[PDB]
Amino acid sequence: EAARDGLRAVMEARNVTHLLQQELTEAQKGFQDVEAQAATANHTVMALMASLDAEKAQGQKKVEELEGEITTLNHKLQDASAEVERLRRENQVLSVRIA
Amino acid sequence: EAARDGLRAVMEARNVTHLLQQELTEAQKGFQDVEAQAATANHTVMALMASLDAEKAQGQKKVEELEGEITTLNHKLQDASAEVERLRRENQVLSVRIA
Amino acid sequence: EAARDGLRAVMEARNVTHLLQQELTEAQKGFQDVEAQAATANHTVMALMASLDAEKAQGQKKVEELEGEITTLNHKLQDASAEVERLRRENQVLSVRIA
Amino acid sequence: EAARDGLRAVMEARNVTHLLQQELTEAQKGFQDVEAQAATANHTVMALMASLDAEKAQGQKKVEELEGEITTLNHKLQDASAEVERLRRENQVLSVRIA
Amino acid sequence: EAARDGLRAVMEARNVTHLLQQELTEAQKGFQDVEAQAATANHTVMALMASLDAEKAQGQKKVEELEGEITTLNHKLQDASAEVERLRRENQVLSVRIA
Amino acid sequence: EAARDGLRAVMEARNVTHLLQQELTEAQKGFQDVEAQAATANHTVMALMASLDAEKAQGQKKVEELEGEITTLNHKLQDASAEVERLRRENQVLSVRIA
Amino acid sequence: EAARDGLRAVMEARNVTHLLQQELTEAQKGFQDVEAQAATANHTVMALMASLDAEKAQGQKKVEELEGEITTLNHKLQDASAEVERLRRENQVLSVRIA
Amino acid sequence: EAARDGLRAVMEARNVTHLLQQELTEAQKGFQDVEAQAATANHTVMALMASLDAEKAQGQKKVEELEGEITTLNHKLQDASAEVERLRRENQVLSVRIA
Amino acid sequence: EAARDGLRAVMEARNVTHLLQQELTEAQKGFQDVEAQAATANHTVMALMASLDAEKAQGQKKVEELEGEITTLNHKLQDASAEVERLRRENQVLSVRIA
Amino acid sequence: EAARDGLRAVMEARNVTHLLQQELTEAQKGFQDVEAQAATANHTVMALMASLDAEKAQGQKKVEELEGEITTLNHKLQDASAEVERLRRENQVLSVRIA
Amino acid sequence: EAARDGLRAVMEARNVTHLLQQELTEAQKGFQDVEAQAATANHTVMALMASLDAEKAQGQKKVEELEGEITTLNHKLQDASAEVERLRRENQVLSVRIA
Amino acid sequence: EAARDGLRAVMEARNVTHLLQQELTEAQKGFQDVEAQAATANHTVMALMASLDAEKAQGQKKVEELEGEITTLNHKLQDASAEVERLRRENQVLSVRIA
Ligand SMILES: [Ca+2]
Ligand SMILES: [Ca+2]
């Protein structure tokens, strides 16, 4: 009668451990998903950080190309303007002689 | 979603280990009771053996006694009956010596 | 870092439930052994009681028997002795009748 | 003796159920932490996506600016070089007259 | 799919041993009832043998007792008749002594 | 490792359930023998009871017979004692008539 | 003698069921570990698939970006070549006039 | 009557051990199927890892190709645009001569 | 059930037949003793007839001897009586002469 | 099979009991006739004994009667004889006077 | 005397034969009843054996009906599967023409 | 004469009662043999009943196994069957383009 009760008790405990074990399998599936979600996010962060680096570097290099081109064009404009002025003077000098 | 369903399951699982600890308590109670009752039952067995052994040794010795008395009486009866018979014969031989 | 610790915990918990189930297995065996031993012990009590009652009854009836046989013998012996005596007197009367 | 084993079984079971509880506590702390990371990380993804956009748009606008500067400088260069030659001819025409 | 059928099979294998275990108990009870009845049967056989022997003894002794009252009474009757006869002679002798 | 441990557990089980079957065969043998052995004990009980009823009828009737002889002898002794007493009185009256 | 063997038999049968149960407990543990492992594995497959997908989507996007850039540069390169040829023709047309 | 209930219990027991044998067979098959499946699962993990790597390497190679195309087109865009500016000044130089 | 009652009746009938066998021994003995008694009574009748014959013969002869003695003594008594009378007349005649 | 043999043995037992019953009627008649016979012999012994006692006592008495008669006659003979002798002497005396 | 004892035993014998008759009636009823029972028992055994044969036969037939249903489905499944494979290769061939 | 016929009848009765005794033994054996039969029949019935129950259990279980197999096969078949139809319509659509 006391062996009845105990035995019943131990059997309920068995069925409950089994209910528990299951939930441990739901838990685990839950972590794993949560891990994957986080791992994925950490991946994107890294991917995007790298992209931002590359895009800074490319944009920076392209600017320094163009600015190099601008300066070269300026030096050539300087010489062309010098030449114009030189010719303007030399024009007014010749202009006086005859008229 | 899945962070939540996994959490939900760890929570449930936690709750259930309270049920378990209860069944384990009932079970503990059953075993302690079972031990008390075994102790009662063995005392009885021991008391009963003791009585039976007491009762045998006594009966065996008592039977021995009465059987010694019986054989003794038998040897006496044999003699006394052989004595009657021999006097009966002796008598009849003498009474013929008269009549 | 926390995803891992948590998952670890869920797996460990699992390992633990096994251990649980194992002790539950042992607890179940114990109570089945206990019920078997109780059932046996009750049977012994009843066996022993019934052997005590049968040993008392037997002893008391054997004592009856043997005492019966004794007093019978006593009555026979008294009679044989009383017969010897009277045959001894009757002899002495007839022998005086000759000498 | 079998009650002894069993009840010991049940006491270990109890102790195991505690260890279980503990591990389930840790599992729960870790989910929550894992969830919280997901949130922080998703922010940084959304923040980095927006910075990458802002940087593509900005760089594109700077290039367009500098490219606009280069064409202007090219127009000026042409015009000056035109002006140089126009003077040169007009110079030699004036040159001829007097000498 | 298979891991689940396996577990499902084991859990049924367990339920069914528990069935085996009850039948073992019934089985155990049946053998003990058998011994008890055999042992009862033997008790009754011995008690009847002892009653038989005691009845033969009580009857032998009762036959002795009564036969001893019978022969005692005979001797008294025979004596009472010899006393009658001798007082009848002695009477006649005296009445002759008068008339 | 864990699939193997279980597989191994299931194989051992399978072997174990064979042993079980063996013992269950022995158990079946044991009961079938018993039912045979039990009818014998009853036959004897019945026989012995028959003997004991028979042996009691004989005594009761024998006791009837002798008790009848006894009461007959008593009534014969009555008359004879009533005679002695009347002759004793008659005697005493006559011997007063002499002394 | 036969109730001996039958009983001994049933008692062995019992100790055998304990052995059974033990092995069933190990089998249940194995299935549960095998399913936990299955769940990890299915999860990994899924994580890995989804990473493979995201790697292809990323690369697919980056390629489309670059290929648009290439078409732009070809539209610009054509124009420049069209302009070179136009100027060559207009160069030779003006070349013929004077010379 | 108790021999019966004992024997019937033993007969059920025996039948039951046949069902046990069968469930143990299912259980054994299940473990073997589970094992086969783990092996397929590890294969797919391996393939998928290996494909992820190839995809990373492939994409990196495709980009590097396209970036090589983009720098080429840019060098050609430079040479044509020098050529066009050279021609534009040589157009306006000749342009003024005649008009 | 019905097999017990019948077996019971057959065992009762067996004991009854042992009785019957005993009462037939008693009946046999009676007839043999009663025949011995008829024989003895017949001898006695014959001896009593022999004795009555002997007694009547002896008696009748004695009477005759005495009756003959008587008549002889009658004859002698007449002769003497007649002589007396003759001598009285003869004496009275001589008495008349003398005186 | 066994139930037919038995039933048959029972029904033969029945018929034999009927035969028994018949012989016992005859036995009963024997005794009754034998007792009637012994009565008649007893009357004959008693009549013969009484005829014997009458014959003897009668005859002894007759003898005394005759012997007394004989002595009475012997006395009368002596008187007659004495008278003759007296008358012969008395006559011879008167004879001596006369002649 | 001896004739009374005999006559008494014969009257007892008679009354014993009446008892015997009674018991024989009971034995006869016993046999008739036990034969009726044997018939019934043997009817039950025959019905059960037939029932057990039905049941085996029914199960064995039902297995065959299902296994045969299974092999058919396996044929259909192989045709269908075969057809998919065929169509896929046929589709890929047409797919190689078009794109 | 009558004391012969009566002794004769007692002698014959004595020989009959030996006959009776013989029949009773036979009747006895008959019962003991009929009882043993009854017991054998009873075991057989029980055995058959237990056999039947096992056969119904084992059968029912086999069916379940097969019916379950049947359903899983009906599932697979529907997928393959849907896949064919699908590829047929898909194939006819590509067949319409080409020819
Ligand atoms: Ca342990
Ligand atoms: Ca093990």
Helices vs. strands in chain K: H and E counts, helices first: 1, 0
Q: Do chains F and L touch (3 or more CB pairs under 8 A)?
A: yes
User: CB-CB: which of A27, A56, A73 is closest to D27?
Assistant: A27
Q: Shortest CA distance to E38 belongs to which of F41, I31, G43, C6?
A: F41
Q: Shortest CA distance to I87 belongs to which of J85, J75, J77?
A: J85
C-alpha A44: how far from chain center: 9
Angle between helix J2-98 and L2-98 (nearest 10)? 170
Residue whose tokens read 């008694």: I37
Rounded CA-CA distance L20/I13 in Å is 9
Rounded CA-CA distance D36/D41 in Å is 9
For chain I, the residues whose C-beta falls within 8 A of a C-beta of chain J are: 13, 20, 27, 30-31, 34, 37-38, 41-42, 44-45, 48-49, 51-52, 55-56, 58-59, 62-63, 66-67, 69-70, 73-74, 76-77, 80-81, 83-84, 87-88, 90-91, 94-95, 97-98
Q: Which ligand is closest in space to the CA of residue C23?
A: 1
Rounded CA-CA distance A34/B4 in Å is 9
**Resolution given for this structure, in angstroms:** 2.3
For chain I, the residues whose C-beta falls within 8 A of a C-beta of chain L are: 3, 6-7, 10-11, 13-14, 17, 20-21, 24-25, 27-28, 31-32, 34-35, 38
| Residue B71: half-sphere exposure toward Cβ, Cα within 13 Å | 5
Q: Note whether F79 and E84 are within 8 A (CB).
A: no
Give me F69's structure tokens: 């002889």
Q: Shortest CA distance to B86 belongs to which of C73, C83, C74, C95?
A: C83
Q: Shortest CA distance to L27 belongs to which of J1, K28, J9, K19?
A: J9
CB contact under 8 A, G36 and C28: no
Rounded CA-CA distance H17/H10 in Å is 11
L14 neighbourhood in chain I, CB within 8 Å: 21, 24-25, 28
User: CB-CB: which of L6, L14, L34 is closest to I31?
Assistant: L6
- For chain D, state the CA radius of gyration: 43
Rounded CA-CA distance A7/A1 in Å is 10
- For chain A, helix, strand, coil in percent to 5 are 100, 0, 0
Q: Note whether E36 and C43 are within 8 A (CB).
A: yes
Contacting partners of chain K (3+ CB pairs under 8 A):
I, J, L
Distance from CA of I42 to the nearest CA of K (A): 17
Q: CATH code at C54?
A: 1.20.5.1700
DSSP of K35-85, one letter per residue? HHHHHHHHHHHHHHHHHHHHHHHHHHHHHHHHHHHHHHHHHHHHHHHHHHH
The three-point CA angle K12-K15-K20 to 5° equals 125
Q: Shortest CA distance to J29 belongs to which of H95, L7, F47, C29?
A: L7
Other CB atoms within 10 A of residue G48 CB: 19
Q: What's the maximum distance between 2 C-alpha atoms anywhere in chain B?
A: 142
Q: Do chains K and L touch (3 or more CB pairs under 8 A)?
A: yes
Residue whose tokens read 């009461």: F71
CB contact under 8 A, B23 and A16: yes
Rounded CA-CA distance D2/C38 in Å is 11
Q: Which helix (H) or strand (E) holds E78?
A: helix E3-96
Query: Which spans in D1-99 are helix H?
Result: 2-98
Give me A69's structure tokens: 């081109």
Instruction: Count how many domains chain E has.
Output: 1
Rounded CA-CA distance J38/J45 in Å is 10
Q: Which helix (H) or strand (E) holds H16?
A: helix H2-98
Rounded CA-CA distance E60/E55 in Å is 8
CB contact under 8 A, A10 and B23: yes
User: CB-CB: which of F32, F35, F43 is closest to L32?
Assistant: F43
User: What is residue G32's DSSP assignment?
Assistant: H
D22 by DSSP, 3-state: which?
Answer: helix
Cα distances (Å, whole numbers) of residue H66 to A63, G66, H80: 21, 7, 21
Q: Note whether E21 and G14 are within 8 A (CB).
A: yes
Rounded CA-CA distance L42/L29 in Å is 20
Angle between helix F3-96 and G2-98 (nearest 10)? 160
Rounded CA-CA distance L81/K81 in Å is 8
3-state secondary structure F25-48: HHHHHHHHHHHHHHHHHHHHHHHH
Q: Name the amino acid, one letter, at C58.
A: Q
Rounded CA-CA distance J62/I67 in Å is 11
| Residue E92: half-sphere exposure toward Cβ, Cα within 13 Å | 5
Residue whose tokens read 């299940």: H30
Distance from CA of G76 to the nearest CA of C (A): 52
Q: Name the amino acid, one letter, at I66.
A: L
Rounded CA-CA distance G95/G88 in Å is 10
The 10 Å CB-count burial string (b at 16+, else e) for E58-73 is bbebbbbebeeeeeeb
Method for this entry: X-ray
Q: Give the length of chain B.
A: 99
Handedness of CA K30, K33, K39, K44 (dihedral sign): negative
DSSP of H50-77, one letter per residue? HHHHHHHHHHHHHHHHHHHHHHHHHHHH
Other CB atoms within 10 A of residue J93 CB: 11
Give me F25's structure tokens: 């065969």
The 10 Å CB-count burial string (b at 16+, else e) for D18-43 is ebbbebbebbbebbebbbebbeebee
Query: Which spans in chain I are helix H?
Result: 2-98
Rounded CA-CA distance C48/A17 in Å is 44
Contacting partners of chain H (3+ CB pairs under 8 A):
D, E, F, G, L
| Residue E93: half-sphere exposure toward Cβ, Cα within 13 Å | 8
Q: Note whether E13 and H34 are within 8 A (CB).
A: no
Q: Note whether A94 and D94 are within 8 A (CB).
A: yes
User: CB-CB: which of D42, D49, D91 is closest to A48?
Assistant: D49
DSSP of C51-95, one letter per residue? HHHHHHHHHHHHHHHHHHHHHHHHHHHHHHHHHHHHHHHHHHHHH
Q: Note whether A14 and C21 are within 8 A (CB).
A: yes
Residue whose tokens read 């049977």: C43
User: What is residue G68's DSSP assignment?
Assistant: H
Q: Note whether F60 and G37 are within 8 A (CB).
A: no
Cα distances (Å, whole numbers) of residue A51 to A44, A46, D59, H56, H67: 10, 9, 14, 15, 15
Rounded CA-CA distance L41/K45 in Å is 8
Rounded CA-CA distance K56/K60 in Å is 6
Residues 6+ apart with CB under 8 A from I16: K16, K19, K20, K23
- The parent domain of residue B40 ranges over 1-99
Q: Shortest CA distance to L56 belongs to which of K67, K54, F14?
A: K54
Q: Note whether I2 and K33 are within 8 A (CB).
A: yes
Handedness of CA K63, K65, K67, K73 (dihedral sign): negative
CB contact under 8 A, K9 and I17: no
Q: How close is the Cα of G10 to the center of ligand 1, in Å? A: 26
User: What is residue H47's DSSP assignment?
Assistant: H
Q: Note whether F39 and G25 are within 8 A (CB).
A: no
Cα distances (Å, whole numbers) of residue K84 to F44, K80, K87, K94, K99: 84, 6, 5, 15, 22
CB contact under 8 A, I3 and K29: no
Rounded CA-CA distance G3/B53 in Å is 25
Other CB atoms within 10 A of residue C75 CB: 15
Q: Give the length of chain C.
A: 99
Q: How close is the Cα of C23 to the center of ligand 1, in Å? A: 5
The three-point CA angle H85-H86-H92 to 5° equals 85
Q: Give the length of chain A.
A: 99
Q: Which of L14, L40, L51 to mutate to test the interface with K (most CBs of K within 10 A)?
A: L51
Residue whose tokens read 């009574």: I41
Q: Which of L23, L28, L40 to mutate to test the interface with I (most CBs of I within 10 A)?
A: L28
Q: Can you list the pairs that G31-34 forms with residues at least 24 positions away whose Cβ atoms lie under 8 Å?
A: G31/E3, G31/E6, G31/E7, G31/E10, G31/F6, G31/H30, G31/H31, G31/H34, G32/A21, G32/C14, G32/C18, G32/E7, G33/C14, G33/F2, G33/F6, G34/E3, G34/E6, G34/F2, G34/F3, G34/F6, G34/H31, G34/H34, G34/H38
Q: Note whether G26 and F6 are within 8 A (CB).
A: yes
User: CB-CB: which of G6, G7, G34 is closest to F6?
Assistant: G34
Q: Note whether I16 and K20 are within 8 A (CB).
A: yes
Q: Shortest CA distance to D74 belongs to which of G39, H26, A70?
A: A70
The three-point CA angle B50-C35-H15 to 5° equals 125
Rounded CA-CA distance B66/B70 in Å is 6
C97 by DSSP, 3-state: which?
Answer: coil
Rounded CA-CA distance G11/C41 in Å is 14
Residues 6+ apart with CB under 8 A from J35: K3, K4, K7
D27 neighbourhood in chain B, CB within 8 Å: 10
CB contact under 8 A, F39 and L36: yes
Give me I41's structure tokens: 């009574």
Q: Which of C33, C46, C64 to mutate to test the interface with E (most CBs of E within 10 A)?
A: C64
Other CB atoms within 10 A of residue F4 CB: 11
User: What is residue B99's DSSP assignment?
Assistant: -
| Residue C88: half-sphere exposure toward Cβ, Cα within 13 Å | 9
Give me E92's structure tokens: 């006649």
Q: Which of E17, E45, E92 to mutate to test the interface with F (most CBs of F within 10 A)?
A: E45
CB contact under 8 A, A52 and D48: yes
H79 by DSSP, 3-state: which?
Answer: helix
Give me E15's structure tokens: 């339920």
Give me A38's structure tokens: 């986080």
Residue whose tokens read 């008068």: E98
Rounded CA-CA distance G96/G88 in Å is 12
Give me E46's structure tokens: 């011995």
| Residue F48: half-sphere exposure toward Cβ, Cα within 13 Å | 20
Cα distances (Å, whole numbers) of residue I83 to C9, I75, I79: 186, 13, 6
Q: Note whether I21 and L24 are within 8 A (CB).
A: no
Q: Note whether J90 and I98 are within 8 A (CB).
A: no
Q: Shortest CA distance to C38 belongs to which of A6, D8, A12, E39?
A: A6
Q: Note whether E32 and G7 are within 8 A (CB).
A: yes
Torsion of Cα atoms, F17 then F23 then F25 then F30, to 10°: -160
Give me K45's structure tokens: 């055994």
| Residue H88: half-sphere exposure toward Cβ, Cα within 13 Å | 19
C-alpha E32: how far from chain center: 26
Q: How close is the Cα of I6 to the center of ligand 2, in Å? A: 59
Cα distances (Å, whole numbers) of residue K57 to G77, K54, L60: 91, 5, 13
Q: Note whether L59 and K55 are within 8 A (CB).
A: yes
Contacting partners of chain D (3+ CB pairs under 8 A):
A, B, C, H
Chain E residue at shortest CA distance from F28? E27
Rounded CA-CA distance A70/D70 in Å is 6
Distance from CA of A6 to the nearest CA of D (A): 10
- For chain B, state the CA radius of gyration: 43
The three-point CA angle C18-C21-C25 to 5° equals 140
Give me E26's structure tokens: 């019934």
L54 neighbourhood in chain H, CB within 8 Å: 14-15, 18
For residue F98, count CB atoms less than 10 angstroms from its CB and return exposed for 0-12, middle for 13-18, buried for 19 or more: exposed
User: CB-CB: which of A38, A66, A80 is closest to D34?
Assistant: A38
Torsion of Cα atoms, J51 then J52 then J58 then J59, to 10°: 140
CB contact under 8 A, H10 and F28: yes
